[PDB]
Design a protein around this nucleic acid. Structure first.
Lengths: 98, 96, 81, 110, 97, 81, 110, 96
DNA sequence: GCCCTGGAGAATCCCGGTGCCGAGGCCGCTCAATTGGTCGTAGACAGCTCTAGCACCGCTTAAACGCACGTACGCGCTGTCCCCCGCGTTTTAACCGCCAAGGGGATTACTCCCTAGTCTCCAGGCACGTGTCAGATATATACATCCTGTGCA
DNA sequence: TGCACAGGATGTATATATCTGACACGTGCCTGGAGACTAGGGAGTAATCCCCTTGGCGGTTAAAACGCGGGGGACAGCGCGTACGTGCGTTTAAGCGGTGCTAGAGCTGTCTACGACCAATTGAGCGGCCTCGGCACCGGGATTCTCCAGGGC
């Protein structure tokens, strides 16, 4: 009796919404903490420009979005609609990163 | 007073006012366009440098730039770019 | 020192990225894989950026360093310098 | 006495700076010498490319019902024009988003 | 009853043989004719160096072999053992061509 | 004037390439698809090589021109110069 | 009188030509000035890389019962060493072939 | 006679006699090694030139070569190359 | 029992009104481009040699081509179950604004050491010539591999 | 009667003998590298300013997390029929070797027009400033799409 959308309607809705928007999708403070942690291993007491952290975020998001596009293509080639770690790995091996 | 920085912003604005008179641009978009002009400059100039070295020449000329444009641009863009550059050089030679 | 910061990239965030990528259904094992891939990419870029910063004899990592590292990796970014 | 100064950009009919391009060519470690027509050719080519991108971006902004060009409009122009997509295929445009694209197998079965 | 090998034994044998050898696998005169025909559309009365044509052939074989490796990977991803035009197209799409 | 020279690549040669690539079973449409792919690749490289030859004011394409074109496309070739 | 000439390569302990590398750096359009230790460092690095590749290729030739290195042995060395493969990941070696790799699903069932 | 062409063949042969005293090399393999040395030289020199331009300097130095080696080589290769180059520069400064 | 359809209901679109902050124009000044002239060399040009790319022929034979058979494999279908999705409630920590302290980037003046530029001198590296041994090829042989007919536990 | 085994056939690795042509060495010469020196500017160093990075605090919500119910998609199993692999006989050019010819690459000598370099002058482009309207946000009403319950065929 309570309203329920079927499994996939809301997912298509989110696809349209986030393909229409342009804003960053990860949280800024957690991403910054991750970047500082990764940089610890390369040099100690490093300082970061805010624009530097923002540029890193934009690059990482663009990379991940393109990777997920290729992953979806691989999954569809396997006659699936669910993306899987093997789809990610096949995309990275065809791109030439592993 | 802050030190002087150079950008292609005023020329980008002039070209924008030529093609779309009632249209403007934001600061981020101007930054992107400045980056685009710099990138294209570096690509064309590096290719011309390599061509001059390959032919054992000491000078970068209009024909080096033309061949670099033909090597770097995709097709119709290349032929229209060649037309524009040839026209500009002919007009410059006619003037002075 | 900082620890466990890869978990600040959360499942809903990976879902939003996948939705922008056009993904309808996501497997539960995707999130750890995406965390590992992101860590690899970030490590590469940050290594190159810190190398640039050290050559300049600076203690602060700048947007120009990030842009140079990305350009070295063939991932040119517009709008930061 | 000395004549009135004209810019080489005005002699060539361009809105891009021939003299600045010449200086950048001379100080960029490209060759030992730079010809006189090379900066003219290069400035003309840069102007043509800029005009192409700006025309397409302004069209997209008009479609969005905006007067100001933004990075979203720049990205839409680039990714929708095929030759500019080939030229800039390895470039990331900050705050540009992606094109709307859903694979037809994911659409509800009708 | 004449001897026959089963369907795949000779194929694996050919795989091992041609992965052991380093020679060029296309016929040189047909490749040269193809190269001259393609160059014909860019300039007339063009002459070629033997080393130019040989370099072109080496690059073309290297490209096709790498593409076929990626195609086999895609076909295996689809739970097949036969490579298909869809596999070639997907491999090229993920490569960026 | 040359015509009908893409058919000289022949099915057995494409099959030999696919064997060196490590494949077991081949479809019938693969041969035509491979002919098209090879033609595209050759057109790109030969166009660039003829551009280099025309810049040098030569009527002969050289191994150097081919190497420079392949290096321009990110496909460096060792052993010809 | 002037002394007997020593080469900068012998001063550095190297088998690679320091002065030739210096001339190439000077005529290559890389910068306006070249320091004294830049060719020394560059020649040392080039010698080290050549030594690594030649060692692996000689080992591969020894496994073949040959005394001369051939392109096939060079390719085997490069493709079997992980860091060298990363360094030469988009280079084609003429007459080198491929590595012997067959996928496991294509092998016969026991 | 023909005009002289420089190559790295005699130096590659010297290093081959250092690492494998009883192994020879064919002419095609020597061509490949020549190409490899020219490629690595061009890569390092270009990275150093870009570094100097980025930092607003007119001189390519050992610092630039070291940084370019770090950027262009993977891991242990970079470590050992940096060790070798530092050794060579120290020896050169000790000598003259 | 299956397909169509009308209502709910949720989401999106569209419109109209407000506030604000960033684009766009203006103004002063200073640094870089322009002007006019000189000079020395890179490149345009003509001439000439000789290498190599093209064209033709004839023969041998490897490789391509066409065909017939059968067998694995691609593909479509069906059924199970479990895992991912949509939704509702609770909890966490991002986010925004504000404040304060100090590190470090950015600039400037000064001086010295390093590098370019020149000239002379000569030895190291390139082209050429020659001989000998590693590798390619034949050939016969021994061994590893595959495939089926056959028998039994 | 479905799963080891024997044995036959086929392909492949191994050893030995001939031969040749390409590698490695020696020689002569020339041109590019080394030695010695000068002059000038790039960069190292010190000192100083002020921006911007970091760190902390508190309040407000948005967003993450956690659990639950159920539908739909992944995956395994089965059957069919066709498309590809395997082998065989016929046909076609490929490769190889010769020869002949000439176009064009490569090199040399001459000379002139073009680009570096320099000094002096000025206006275009940049920084700082100030203002207003494009856009973001809000709220309310209209339209669209999704889903299911219910009834006709």
């Amino acid at each position: 009796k309570p309203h329920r959308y079927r499994p996939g309607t809301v997912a298509l809705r989110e696809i349209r919404r986030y393909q229409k928007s342009t804003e960053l999708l990860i949280r800024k403070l957690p991403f910054q903490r991750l970047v500082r942690e990764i940089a610890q291993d390369f040099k100690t007491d490093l300082r970061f420009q805010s624009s530097a952290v923002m540029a890193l975020q934009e690059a990482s998001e663009a990379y991940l979005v393109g990777l997920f596009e290729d992953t979806n293509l691989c999954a569809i080639h396997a006659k699936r609609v669910t993306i899987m770690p093997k789809d990610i790995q096949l995309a990275r091996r065809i791109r030439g990163e592993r | 007073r802050k030190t002087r920085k150079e950008s292609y912003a005023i020329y980008v604005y002039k070209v924008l006012k030529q093609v779309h008179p009632d249209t403007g641009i934001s600061s981020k978009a101007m930054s992107i366009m400045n980056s685009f002009v710099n990138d294209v400059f570096e690509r064309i100039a590096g290719e011309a440098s390599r061509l001059a070295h390959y032919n054992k020449r000491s000078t970068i000329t209009s024909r080096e730039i033309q061949t670099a444009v033909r090597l770097l641009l995709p097709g119709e863009l290349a032929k229209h770019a060649v037309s524009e550059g040839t026209k500009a050089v002919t007009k410059y030679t006619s003037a002075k | 020192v900082l620890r466990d910061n890869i978990q600040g990239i959360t499942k809903p965030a990976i879902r939003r990225l996948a939705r922008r990528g056009g993904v309808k259904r996501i497997s539960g094992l995707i999130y750890e894989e995406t965390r590992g891939v992101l860590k690899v990419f970030l490590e590469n870029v940050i290594r190159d950026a810190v190398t640039y910063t050290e050559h300049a004899k600076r203690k602060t990592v700048t947007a120009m360093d990030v842009v140079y590292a990305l350009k070295r990796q063939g991932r040119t970014l517009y709008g930061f310098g | 006495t000395r004549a009135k100064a004209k810019t080489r950009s005005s002699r060539a009919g361009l809105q891009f700076p021939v003299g600045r391009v010449h200086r950048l060519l001379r100080k960029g470690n490209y060759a030992e010498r730079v010809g006189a027509g090379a900066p003219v050719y290069l400035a003309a080519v840069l102007e043509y490319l800029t005009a192409e991108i700006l025309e397409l971006a302004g069209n997209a902004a008009r479609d969005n019902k905006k007067t100001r060009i933004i990075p979203r409009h720049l990205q839409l122009a680039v990714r929708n024009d095929e030759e500019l997509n080939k030229l800039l295929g390895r470039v990331t445009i900050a705050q540009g988003g992606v094109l709307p694209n859903i694979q037809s197998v994911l659409l509800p079965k009708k």
